[PDB]
Amino acid sequence: APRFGGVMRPNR
Amino acid sequence: CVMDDFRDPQRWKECAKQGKMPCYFDLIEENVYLTERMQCECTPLSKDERAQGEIACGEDCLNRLLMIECSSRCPNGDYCSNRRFQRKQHADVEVILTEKKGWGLRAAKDLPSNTFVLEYCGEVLDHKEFKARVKEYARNKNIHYYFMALKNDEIIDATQKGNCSRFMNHSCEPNCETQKWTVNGQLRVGFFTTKLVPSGSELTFDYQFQRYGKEAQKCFCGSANCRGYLGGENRVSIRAAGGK
Ligand SMILES: Nc1ncnc2c1ncn2[C@@H]1O[C@H](CSCC[C@H](N)C(=O)O)[C@@H](O)[C@H]1O
Ligand SMILES: [Zn+2]
Ligand SMILES: [Zn+2]
Ligand SMILES: [Zn+2]
């Protein structure tokens, strides 16, 4: 499984 | 090695070898898709109103209110102040080296509140391409991640291609926010200041990072309300991170 990683989510 | 060297790939590559500029990526002026998928009602300003300093398609523009940019067919034509993404009306910014976050971005002049900074450009991916890249970046042992959710089945990846918005670091107490804009019936993400940002201040946004990784990266924003880690407390699955 990836040691690191993620996704940024647009929010206000 | 100035900001202008980003437009000069031969000089930028040299600056990167000497550690004076960040590593090379491809500079793109708009989003690239790996797998491909109206006018406002403002009264046109007269020549005299334009001369007097009147804004065209400003605060009362129907398109702007709905986060829609105007096209070349706008009743205000050339004067339209609501085509910032298209006209690359980016704020004056600088790429800086931070102490422990890698490279970053800072205001090169004072920026008022709700000022367009830059568009978050990159390669738009579907769920299958996103999963391919998740494995690629994990296999490469990449430290930095550049995935920005656009819409449920669209991820903007600025790892290989993008612009200097790929240098905006996270903050638990930010001075920018993302806004999703409709430009030519296509959605785009841009960074906008949320407050007055003095010259020389680092430009930051709240990632609302969905960490799929086994391990969390520590947050070095230095806010009195810092969450300690990029992603917060929870680890989500890859499908959830990818918007499924
Ligand atoms: N507040 C923060 N604390 C620690 N690392 C941060 C951070 N904000 C951003 N980063 C780092 O920057 C990555 C997002 S990409 C932002 C540009 C990056 N610093 C670069 O040098 O190219 C993250 O995956 C993380 O490694
Ligand atoms: Zn208008
Ligand atoms: Zn307009
Ligand atoms: Zn923090």
Residue numbers in the entry:
A (entry chain H): 29 to 40
B (entry chain A): 1449 to 1485, 1497 to 1703
The authors write:
The methylation of the ε-amino group of lysine residues is catalyzed by protein lysine methyltransferases (PKMTs), which can introduce up to three methyl groups with high specificity using S-Adenosyl-L-methionine (AdoMet) as methyl group donor. The SET-domain containing protein 2 (SETD2, also called KMT3A) PKMT was first identified as huntingtin interacting protein 1 (HYPB, HIP-1). It has a size of 230 kDa corresponding to 2564 amino acids and can add up to three methyl groups to K36 of histone H39. The ability for trimethylation of H3K36 makes SETD2 unique, because no other trimethyltransferase for this lysine residue is known in human cells.
To understand the molecular basis of the super-substrate methylation by SETD2, we determined the crystal structure of the human SETD2 catalytic domain (aa 1435–1711) bound to AdoHcy and the super-substrate peptide containing a target lysine to methionine mutation (ssK36M). We observed clear electron density for the ssK36M peptide and a cofactor product corresponding to AdoHcy, feasibly formed from AdoMet under the crystallization conditions. The ssK36M peptide is in an extended conformation, and AdoHcy is surrounded by residues of the SET and post-SET domains. The super-substrate carries four amino acid exchanges (A31R, T32F, K37R, and H39N) with respect to the canonical H3K36 peptide. Although not completely resolved by electron density, the side chain of ssK36M R31 (in its most likely conformation ttt18033,34) may form a salt bridge with the side chain of Glu1674. The aromatic F32 side chain of ssK36M is inserted into a shallow pocket formed by the side chains of Glu1674 and Gln1676 making more extensive hydrophobic interactions than T32 of H3K36M. In conclusion, the substituted residues in the super-substrate ssK36M interact with SETD2 mainly through the post-SET domain loop and the α6 helix of the SETD2 catalytic domain.
